[PDB]
Amino acid sequence: DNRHAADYQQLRERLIQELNLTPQQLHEESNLIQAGLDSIRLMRWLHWFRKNGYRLTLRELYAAPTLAAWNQLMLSRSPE
Ligand SMILES: *P(=O)(O)OCC(C)(C)[C@@H](O)C(=O)NCCC(=O)NCCSC(=O)c1ccccc1O
């Protein structure tokens, strides 16, 4: 399978570090932009997973800010 999808696990955990909350109290079905998530965090994300060959632009992440959709945006997104 895609072993790099584990990068999502570190993603999920990483927001928690900045959000100062537990990985249980995060809403991946709700919008993460409802939490303390600015664009520098967001632009960081692109670059951060891009190193594993993840391809996505900025706006799909904004359109559906949910890890549920972001995981799709990671693995396939839609090529480039
Ligand atoms: P961030 O706010 O700095 O956003 C960085 C982007 C928008 C990707 C850059 O293009 C940029 O040069 N900075 C513009 C900063 C600014 O004034 N804010 C615009 C945000 S538009 C948007 O869709 C968005 C993105 C992320 C968080 C909140 C938000 O409203």
UniProtKB/TrEMBL annotation:
Organism: Yersinia pestis
Span covered, complete protein: 14 to 93 of 2035
Name of this protein: Yersiniabactin biosynthetic protein
Domain of life: Bacteria
